[PDB]
A = this chain, B = another copy of it.
Amino acid sequence: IMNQETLIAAVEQMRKLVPALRKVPDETLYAWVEMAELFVCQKTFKDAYVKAIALYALHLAFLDGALKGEDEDLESYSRRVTSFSLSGEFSQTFGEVTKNQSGNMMLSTPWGKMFEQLKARRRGRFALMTGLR
């Protein structure tokens, strides 16, 4: 981060991407975006830095449920509910949205895959280096 206009623009773009975030208090959004700015390199993008940082923050918060914590919750971060039902009124069944056989961990959310393809457009995902002198 270098100013507040960029932070506000990133939060607003994130809310435009996900309209559900407009009701979430903006303080957690500031926290998540300032934690996500640690991973992005503005030298590489230098024009879509806000877009990339918002995308990465969204993916980072939606990895497996990390923003799932509101002011009231318990330690359910190790375990996931698979079904819940009242005995004679209603029943409901859950499940994971995406399988991740690859294990790269970055293609765990749609925003992660979008960020990877945007990284390949801006500057390739290669890493080729040689010992100098």
Copies of this chain assembled into the complex: 6
The number of residues on chain A lying at the interface, defined by a beta carbon within 8 Å of a beta carbon of chain B, is 70
- Report yes or no: B66 in contact with A18, Cβ–Cβ below 8 A: yes
User: Cα distance A110–B87 when bound, in Å?
Assistant: 34
Shortest C-beta distance, A67 to chain B (Å), equals 6
User: Cα distance A31–B101 when bound, in Å?
Assistant: 31
- Report yes or no: B96 in contact with A105, Cβ–Cβ below 8 A: no
- Report yes or no: B71 in contact with A22, Cβ–Cβ below 8 A: yes
A85 within 8 A of B: yes
Residue contacts A-B, CB under 8 angstroms, 10 given: A16-B27, A18-B69, A20-B68, A20-B71, A21-B75, A63-B114, A65-B78, A68-B75, A79-B96, A80-B96
